[PDB]
Amino acid sequence: VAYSNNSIAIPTNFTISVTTEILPVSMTKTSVDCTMYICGDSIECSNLLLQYGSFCTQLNRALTGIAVEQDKNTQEVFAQVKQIYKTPPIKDFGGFNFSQILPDPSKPSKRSFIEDLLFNKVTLADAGFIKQYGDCLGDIAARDLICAQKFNGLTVLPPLLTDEMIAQYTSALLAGTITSGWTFGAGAALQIPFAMQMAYRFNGIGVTQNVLYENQKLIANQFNSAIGKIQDSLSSTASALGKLQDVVNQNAQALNTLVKQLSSNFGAISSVLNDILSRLDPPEAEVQIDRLITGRLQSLQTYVTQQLIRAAEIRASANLAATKMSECVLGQSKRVDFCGKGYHLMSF
Amino acid sequence: VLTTSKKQFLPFQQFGRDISDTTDAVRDPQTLEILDITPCSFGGVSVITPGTNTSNQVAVLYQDVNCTEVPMAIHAEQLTPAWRVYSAGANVFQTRAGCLVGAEHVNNSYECDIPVGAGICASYHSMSSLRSVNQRSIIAYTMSLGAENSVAYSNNSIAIPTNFTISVTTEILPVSMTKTSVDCTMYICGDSIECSNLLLQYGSFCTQLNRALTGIAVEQDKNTQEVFAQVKQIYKTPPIKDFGGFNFS
Amino acid sequence: YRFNGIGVTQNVLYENQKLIANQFNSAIGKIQDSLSSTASALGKLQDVVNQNAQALNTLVKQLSSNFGAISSVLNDILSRLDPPEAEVQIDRLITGRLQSLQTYVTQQLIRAAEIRASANLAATKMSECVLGQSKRVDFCGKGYHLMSFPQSAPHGVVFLHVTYVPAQEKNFTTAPAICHEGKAHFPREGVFVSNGTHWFITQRNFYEPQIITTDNTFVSGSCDVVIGIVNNTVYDPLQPE
Ligand SMILES: *[C@@H]1O[C@H](CO)[C@@H](O[C@@H]2O[C@H](CO)[C@@H](O)[C@H](O)[C@H]2NC(C)=O)[C@H](O)[C@H]1NC(C)=O
Ligand SMILES: *[C@@H]1O[C@H](CO)[C@@H](O[C@@H]2O[C@H](CO)[C@@H](O)[C@H](O)[C@H]2NC(C)=O)[C@H](O)[C@H]1NC(C)=O
Ligand SMILES: *[C@@H]1O[C@H](CO)[C@@H](O[C@@H]2O[C@H](CO)[C@@H](O)[C@H](O)[C@H]2NC(C)=O)[C@H](O)[C@H]1NC(C)=O
Ligand SMILES: *[C@@H]1O[C@H](CO)[C@@H](O[C@@H]2O[C@H](CO)[C@@H](O)[C@H](O)[C@H]2NC(C)=O)[C@H](O)[C@H]1NC(C)=O
Ligand SMILES: *[C@@H]1O[C@H](CO)[C@@H](O[C@@H]2O[C@H](CO)[C@@H](O)[C@H](O)[C@H]2NC(C)=O)[C@H](O)[C@H]1NC(C)=O
Ligand SMILES: *[C@@H]1O[C@H](CO)[C@@H](O[C@@H]2O[C@H](CO)[C@@H](O)[C@H](O)[C@H]2NC(C)=O)[C@H](O)[C@H]1NC(C)=O
Ligand SMILES: *[C@@H]1O[C@H](CO)[C@@H](O[C@@H]2O[C@H](CO)[C@@H](O)[C@H](O)[C@H]2NC(C)=O)[C@H](O)[C@H]1NC(C)=O
Ligand SMILES: *[C@@H]1O[C@H](CO)[C@@H](O)[C@H](O)[C@H]1NC(C)=O
Ligand SMILES: *[C@@H]1O[C@H](CO)[C@@H](O)[C@H](O)[C@H]1NC(C)=O
Ligand SMILES: *[C@@H]1O[C@H](CO)[C@@H](O)[C@H](O)[C@H]1NC(C)=O
Ligand SMILES: *[C@@H]1O[C@H](CO)[C@@H](O)[C@H](O)[C@H]1NC(C)=O
Ligand SMILES: *[C@@H]1O[C@H](CO)[C@@H](O)[C@H](O)[C@H]1NC(C)=O
């Protein structure tokens, strides 16, 4: 950089840039049947587990705490405003186009075109799909992992907030920000013309209001082009939402590894409870069964401990997402690089 | 459960084992027909109940079972009569979370009281037939996100407040947790002279547990110090003086 | 100064000082009544004490379990078995009891990290809201933060957040700029509003209509560039003198 005591550089133009920040809010909620995983529905087994029942209760208590936290994390990020602002019939917004981000009425789930692209990019089909006992029983030939974990007592609990409800919360925040700007976040929403609200945002970053009014047509066109570029980038790049895909992959991998742990024998003659029961009388059988029970309990304990550490990381990201929603979506933030590189104007 | 198996074993092969190593498929000894082996239980039961003091009424939710398949899944025919009532029809409601029985579905939407899941919530409510005798029953309803509202937006219209409200709100944040220390020998040996001779090798593990606990204890004191010791200067409260009429006593 | 920070003029506080003091006193009284009449107020602090007590209680319960040993009582094994046979049974109890202690320590470490994050937020809240006025939205309570008061609580800190919330509002016609004589005029700190036949400049937060004047507004460019410009006269204080 050319530095001089009497030299300064002043911009004679400006660029409007839209950037995407992705933060994980929640992780899959899972519950484990201790007897089904260790005993495998064996009548002889679970008589030994009666003393170990207290340990199983502790594992269930930790898992239930993670599940309630995930619902709370989603609620904090999307339920900041209880008032659901109905999207108005589109009115002149100064030439700014928000139809792509606004929910589409003529489609299922009432979700935005950008939201539809994001849903397509992340594959949750691999992580789980509804399985009836009949569906698993009929499809014996295909070894789907979801049926195998369900048979071993590992199951996934559906989130309390449905995707449609999350979309309705997102639409309400979007409607409030365009129509009333920062006013809806604190106190009752007060309607303001979008161009006048945009001038206030320019005043916040230290640019005079007149510059926005004279260049309003150019500013609206630059914003529309940036939104179009973002949708094209999401559609043409498969690897966009990497963090969200990683969260689903880690949870599915952890359940799959637990099913694999059953194959291991912890010093027992066989890893199959049935084989030990068939070949050994009960006093000799108990010693071998106890070795399998202790190892299987340890595998469940290791899985629960990993889930608790993952939940803490997800909780920190969810807290940041809630802070980002209040600071950038409900207000203009003067923090540097908190709401994107450059001087923040607004966030959707 | 035994079912016919599409998979065919090679002549040397007599039985099949899955990834878990359980015998997924077996061949009948008398007849060479492969039979798949399936666990009888599928799992998935939750009991939604108001406090037992308030009522003994309960609602049962099956996560993976449709209302038609509910009796077969739980083997209701061989179950106790009280269990059969929970598998009985007329209270069955089908949800994405699963079939829910013992709860009366209501169109009205309320703030969630107990979370069934998939946008469905259950509450104990005063639903009375004929509205002449008060009756209490569990109800299943879609949760209410909030009151629907529409902002009136115009290119030349603005709303400006002509008054204001001063509001005081309380935010509670945990600063510290109880500090605890564990005597490894006392907990495991229970003051036994014979015990602890074996623990001499395991002493290193006990030292590791004590080191982690001591670190938590010092952190809790540090957490309290950071929040309350921001200013070392202790400002003496002045005899109360006029504060503009603001009361802080 | 706090009112000036949220964008409300100092004069509004001075004229309404008696009302502002009464509203603050009423809010403090409402808070004390709510705490006294509602048992379930400090849920998070109670949960922290309950979790710690539950963890110690479960550890005492774990002693009852026997990890493949003939008895969970060390004394019974010692009484019925000679030392070589007794050692195998004692070792099974020792390994299981050590595992129970290890599980408890691991849970405590995860809980300590959650408490540490909350304590760090509390320290940030104390510096940003108690020692200063924070412009962050919803960091120091809903509404425009004015000041915060810390109150000591067991295992926690309770923050009383005093905030300014806009009350009743009215509808007013608005224009981005005023065309006085072929020159666009933009309001320096206010929004142009019309009661219906007259145009005034007022602060957005509170309604204080004022006659448009050369000091009140700045003139930039020409009327044609502004899309919503409307015709009005800008008064000049210098011209009568
Ligand atoms: C600031 O940059 C903008 C955008 O690059 C310029 O607007 C362009 O003007 C040229 C004509 O010179 C047109 O061909 C382009 O279509 C305009 N861009 C868009 C996207 O509308 C603008 O001219 C620049 N301003 C200055 C002071 O040079
Ligand atoms: C906002 O942008 C969208 C997408 O560019 C515009 O939607 C187009 O609408 C026309 C009809 O007016 C259709 O023929 C196009 O297929 C739509 N998409 C595209 C890619 O052009 C929408 O009209 C824009 N909103 C306004 C009012 O400008
Ligand atoms: C702004 O709000 C305050 C508080 O509500 C109003 O002051 C009160 O008005 C009511 C209505 O008559 C009186 O009964 C109270 O005695 C007043 N004082 C208080 C502290 O409640 C005030 O009048 C309102 N101002 C406007 C512009 O309407
Ligand atoms: C500030 O408020 C307190 C109450 O919290 C006032 O103290 C007295 O409180 C009792 C009830 O607890 C009332 O019966 C008294 O009337 C209150 N004071 C008096 C002398 O009337 C305290 O006086 C208030 N401070 C001021 C100076 O207004
Ligand atoms: C300011 O104007 C808006 C729009 O006219 C008002 O909002 C409407 O108020 C009427 C009154 O009955 C309702 O029927 C409408 O449903 C409201 N919204 C719409 C979309 O028209 C608003 O109430 C006015 N402000 C005040 C102070 O009344
Ligand atoms: C809008 O505000 C103006 C203030 O300019 C009001 O005009 C006043 O009207 C009253 C009587 O109607 C006169 O006594 C004042 O001298 C006027 N003030 C002036 C000329 O500055 C006007 O009444 C208000 N209302 C409407 C509907 O226009
Ligand atoms: C606001 O005032 C301007 C300036 O007086 C008006 O502009 C005139 O518009 C008429 C047609 O309505 C033209 O014939 C003149 O050439 C314009 N200039 C002048 C100097 O008179 C304008 O009509 C007024 N109204 C609006 C809505 O802008
Ligand atoms: C055994 O006898 C049964 C009944 O007669 C017959 O169905 C089966 O094929 C026989 N299997 C062998 C081993 O021959
Ligand atoms: C049940 O709870 C209520 C308070 O909600 C209490 O008054 C009542 O005593 C409780 N019942 C019993 C049997 O203690
Ligand atoms: C089972 O219930 C679900 C709703 O939870 C429904 O979509 C499905 O069609 C029903 N039928 C099946 C597949 O058993
Ligand atoms: C509930 O809604 C359905 C569908 O609109 C309707 O058929 C039914 O009569 C309504 N009433 C109740 C409480 O079932
Ligand atoms: C405001 O909206 C009306 C109705 O659509 C329109 O006639 C008028 O030209 C618009 N004015 C501006 C400032 O865009």
Numbering used by the authors:
A (entry chain A): 699 to 1046
B (entry chain C): 549 to 797
C (entry chain C): 898 to 1138
Per the authors:
Pangolin coronaviruses (PCoV) closely related to SARS-CoV-2 have also been identified in smuggled Malayan pangolins (Manis javanica) in China’s Guangxi (GX) and Guangdong (GD) provinces. Similarly, PCoV_GX (GenBank: QIA48614.1) shares 92.3% and 86.7% amino acid sequence identity with the SARS-CoV-2 in the spike and RBD, respectively. The overall density maps were solved to 2.48 Å for the PCoV_GX spike and 2.93 Å for the RaTG13 spike (gold-standard Fourier shell correlation = 0.143). In the PCoV_GX spike, the number of RBD-contacting residues is 27 from the counter-clockwise monomer and 16 from the clockwise monomer. The LA could be well modeled into the density and liquid chromatography coupled mass spectrometry (LC-MS) confirmed the presence of LA in the purified PCoV_GX spike. Structural comparison showed a nearly identical binding mode of the LA by the PCoV_GX and SARS-CoV-2 spikes. The PCoV_GX and SARS-CoV-2 RBDs bound to hACE2 with comparable affinities of 2.7 nM and 3.9 nM, respectively. The 2D classification did not show particles with bound hACE2 for the RaTG13 spike, but ~9% of the PCoV_GX particles were bound to hACE2.
The homotrimeric spike (S) glycoprotein of coronaviruses forms a trimer, which plays a critical role in host cell attachment and entry by recognizing cellular receptors and mediating membrane fusion. Consequently, the spike protein, particularly its receptor-binding domain (RBD), is the principal player in determining the host range of coronaviruses.
